[PDB]
Amino acid sequence: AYKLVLIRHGESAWNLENRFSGWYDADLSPAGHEEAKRGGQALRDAGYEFDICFTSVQKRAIRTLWTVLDAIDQMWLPVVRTWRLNERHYGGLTGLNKAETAAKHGEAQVKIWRRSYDVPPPPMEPDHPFYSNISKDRRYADLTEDQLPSCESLKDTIARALPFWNEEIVPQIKEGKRVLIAAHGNSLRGIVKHLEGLSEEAIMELNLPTGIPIVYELDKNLKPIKPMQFL
Amino acid sequence: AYKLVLIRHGESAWNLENRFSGWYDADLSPAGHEEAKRGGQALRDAGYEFDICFTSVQKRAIRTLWTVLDAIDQMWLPVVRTWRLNERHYGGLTGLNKAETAAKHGEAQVKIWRRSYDVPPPPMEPDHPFYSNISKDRRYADLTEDQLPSCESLKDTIARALPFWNEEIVPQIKEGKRVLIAAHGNSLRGIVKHLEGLSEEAIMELNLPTGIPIVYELDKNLKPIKPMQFL
Numbered sequence: 001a002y003k004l005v006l007i008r009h010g011e012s013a014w015n016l017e018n019r020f021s022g023w024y025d026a027d028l029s030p031a032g033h034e035e036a037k038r039g040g041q042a043l044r045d046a047g048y049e050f051d052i053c054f055t056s057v058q059k060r061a062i063r064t065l066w067t068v069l070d071a072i073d074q075m076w077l078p079v080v081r082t083w084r085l086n087e088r089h090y091g092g093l094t095g096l097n098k099a100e101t102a103a104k105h106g107e108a109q110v111k112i113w114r115r116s117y118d119v120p121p122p123p124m125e126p127d128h129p130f131y132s133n134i135s136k137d138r139r140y141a142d143l144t145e146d147q148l149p150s151c152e153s154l155k156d157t158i159a160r161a162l163p164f165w166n167e168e169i170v171p172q173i174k175e176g177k178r179v180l181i182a183a184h185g186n187s188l189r190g191i192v193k194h195l196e197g198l199s200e201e202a203i204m205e206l207n208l209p210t211g212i213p214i215v216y217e218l219d220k221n222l223k224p225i226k227p228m229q230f231l
Numbered sequence: 232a233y234k235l236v237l238i239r240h241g242e243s244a245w246n247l248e249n250r251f252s253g254w255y256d257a258d259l260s261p262a263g264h265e266e267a268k269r270g271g272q273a274l275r276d277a278g279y280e281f282d283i284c285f286t287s288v289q290k291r292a293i294r295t296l297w298t299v300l301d302a303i304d305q306m307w308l309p310v311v312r313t314w315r316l317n318e319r320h321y322g323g324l325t326g327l328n329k330a331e332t333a334a335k336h337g338e339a340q341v342k343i344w345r346r347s348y349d350v351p352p353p354p355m356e357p358d359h360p361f362y363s364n365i366s367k368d369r370r371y372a373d374l375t376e377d378q379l380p381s382c383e384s385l386k387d388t389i390a391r392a393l394p395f396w397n398e399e400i401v402p403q404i405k406e407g408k409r410v411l412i413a414a415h416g417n418s419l420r421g422i423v424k425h426l427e428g429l430s431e432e433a434i435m436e437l438n439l440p441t442g443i444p445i446v447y448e449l450d451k452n453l454k455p456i457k458p459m460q461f462l
């Protein structure tokens with residue numbers, strides 16, 4: 001029955017500095033752009049077609065989608081952007097590199113934050129160097145005070161992604177529309193967890209490849225009939 | 232006063248081949264892409280901010296928009312695509328150059344089609360080389376038999392563009408959303424004609440520059456308080 005394709009964007013400008021990006025609107029790096037080109041070419045070679053695309057409000061996912069649509073000659077497709085598909089919000093860690101994070105927060109907290117499904121990093125406070133840049137960005141002006149995160153656990157990220165999946169994407173799939181979702185590793189983890197009924201342990205061990213189309217075949221109940229395949 | 236900005240795309244691949252494009256989905260030329268970059272930088276330098284963008288389903292306009300959004304750091308804006316902002320459908324002239332057009336159709340008809348507001352070019356028939364490429368493109372699959380043009384006069388083009396202006400663009404302007412329209416000379420002519428109440432001869436004498444932001448200041452009735460100005 002249904003065919004669904006996911007793609008995770010590749011490397012960003014702040015990956016080049018080993019800095020936590022989260023909601024900071026870092027562009028794709030040159031390598032990340034190349035990855036998006038390769039994924040688009042793989043979809044082209046296999047003859048994939050879509051009817052609607054979903055992405056975040058972060059340019060590294062948007063640019064990945066743009067690159068894929070260019071490659072498959074489907075630049076005319078409707079595109080829907082939502083903050084709900086944004087990368088996980090890395091709170092006060094935003095902008096820090098690994099050494100600054102270890103020095104400021106210590107080895108024990110970092111290990112907990114890294115391995116935990118439901119413990120968030122510290123909040124991004126108003127004196128944070130990127131607070132004005134992110135929390136006062138006008139693209140989030142329509143979020144409620146409670147919807148705008150100061151930080152997110154993976155559980156938090158999944159919890160604000162799945163309402164968009166249920167309310168906006170699932171109805172498209174059930175109408176037979178061929179959906180492409182270009183987003184971020186942690187927002188895509190929420191969709192995979194829901195589709196496959198994966199455990200918290202399993203989803204935290206799932207590292208979706210970047211720039212590689214992830215293909216699902218779904219039955220009438222949107223249940224996968226086979227494991228995810230990589231193009 | 233509301234601020235509305237229009238931009239017309241620049242040179243296409245088929246401009247360099249001196250071929251009538253119409254609904255053929257020709258990409259920008261490199262020079263047309265650079266034009267869009269300069270228009271984007273002019274908007275950047277003037278500090279322009281938008282809230283929603285409209286474009287056609289033709290990549291030469293979509294790419295112009297993409298380039299402007301990149302230049303002004305507003306890739307996160309919602310984008311709506313519609314066939315109703317497409318270039319005029321040049322019918323059977325699609326793909327021909329000036330000499331082939333004159334030979335097949337004669338100087339008298341060419342003069343009429345070029346200076347006329349309401350006489351369409353010949354229809355694109357099912358044996359036309361680009362018939363399947365345009366008329367059976369699935370991006371138009373939702374148009375009714377009656378809506379799918381085989382050709383368009385300027386009057387026809389304006390007649391299917393202004394319903395989109397009223398259906399989707401006017402409601403945004405009324406809510407105070409700052410609109411950017413990236414489209415084609417003849418579909419933008421429909422908006423200019425409507426806004427300033429120009430005659431058929433005036434709109435046909437008006438040549439909108441490519442790559443130059445065109446700025447309207449509109450009163451509460453969406454009526455221009457002064458004529459369009461170039462940035």
Ligand SMILES: *S(=O)(=O)c1cccc(S(=O)(=O)Nc2cc(C3=CCCC3)ccc2C(=O)OC)c1
Pocket residue numbers: 019020021022087088090098110113114121185186
């Ligand atoms: S996230 O998926 O967008 C992201 C960004 C940057 C690095 C990583 S990592 O590969 O998982 N390494 C890592 C993650 C963390 C986390 C704290 C909050 C949640 C995740 C801490 C430390 C490290 C690291 O590698 O230590 C040196 C994931």
Ligand SMILES: *S(=O)(=O)c1cccc(S(=O)(=O)Nc2cc(C3=CCCC3)ccc2C(=O)OC)c1
Pocket residue numbers: 250251252253318319321324329341344345352416417
């Ligand atoms: S149109 O605005 O997209 C377009 C494309 C290419 C060339 C022109 S032109 O400069 O106006 N010359 C031209 C136009 C036409 C038309 C037939 C249908 C509507 C317009 C016919 C002939 C010529 C030409 O210059 O013949 C010498 C516009």
Ligand SMILES: [Cl-]
Pocket residue numbers: 079310
């Ligand atoms: Cl877009």
